[model samples]
Target: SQQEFLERARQYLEEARRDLTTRPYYYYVGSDSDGTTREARSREEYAKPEKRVRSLIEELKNKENYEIYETDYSWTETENGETRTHHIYFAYVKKDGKLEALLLRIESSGPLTDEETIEKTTRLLDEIYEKLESLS
Candidate 1:
């Protein structure tokens, strides 16, 4: 039963990982603003390799044995006159009466197949990757 826990979590997260690899998940939205708030013409969208993304998942590997719990949540925000949906995965372990863990968020719009959303989502993931690298 315990072994299946890790297996299931890995399989469940594979969808996000697969998209990170096959789709254009890299983006250039900048920290200044979402879009209209800034003077930029358009958001630069692109894709990046999954190597760095994997590193983020690794942070949870150590917390797995602590009886950690995982869950996902979504929220919608309009950007550039379009509703962008963000889906996030989180793993938490209760410690000293508190829950602490990692969260991986990727956004989509309308349908899960929105190409533009995937590209920018990848871009957001890119920044997350950078931050994780700093923490390590």
Candidate 2:
């Protein structure tokens, strides 16, 4: 179901793209890691996939426009003889919720990027950002 994961991520991006024009939300980006794991051994540790999502839900719980749509992309690369997986999420938060968020997530990783549909997803995010920046 690897294809399904990637497809779902792309679908989220597609939804974000369509919502870009009609929706009233602020855009943001954040990332996280799977620490040092890969392939089989690392698979089990991804159980906390919603850690970020849950935090955002609570973080915005007090706001009037407490809603969000987030699209995420992740891939693994070897660095310093260790395998690491990184995730990047593109978020659309309501304007009222935007005024309330003072916290932002940041990440550090070795040099690089990813593959075919990953590149397409990245490009789609680029387009979303371009449009987002234009409005600001």
Candidate 3:
């Protein structure tokens, strides 16, 4: 039974990885007008995908004892007629006899080019990981 559970867990982990690899785009859209209001499209600049992935993996390894559970990557249709890519990583671990789940989300409107996104995401994950670690 334990083996079966582990196998299922492995599948979830793979799914999570796939999601992260495919979808990881973030964007923001709004509307403004003086005479008439209309939807406006704007891209939120972010860091390179490689860097973000690397940092996320590194942070997870260093700060948490979590294993990937599920991931999904897909294009989200926006009202502004723009399709944005997003990545979602799900992970879980047993610490101090308690199960903990973590979700990491990243998105990009255009191509990732900045480093802040990576840094911010990594930092947030690190903080949560550290808190979890301390409990153990």
Highest TM-score against the true fold, candidate:
2
Give all TM-scores, in the order shown. Answer: 0.30, 0.36, 0.26
Q: Model 2, range 60-107, lDDT digits (tens) per residue?
A: 655364545555566567769977544445444444533211111112
TM-score: model 3 vs. ground truth: 0.26
Please report how far candidate 2 places residue 35 from its true position, in Å: 30
By the lDDT metric, which is better: model 1 or model 3? 1
lDDT agreement of model 2 with the native: 0.40
The numbered model that scores best in lDDT is 2
Please list the Cα RMSD from the true structure of every candidate, rounded to 1 decimal place: 16.0, 15.0, 16.7
- Report lDDT (CA) for all predictions: 0.39, 0.40, 0.36
Ranking by lDDT: 2, 1, 3
Q: Which stretches of candidate 2 lie over 4 Å from their true place?
A: 1-67, 77-81, 95-98, 102-118
Off by over 4 Å in 1: 20-77, 94-136
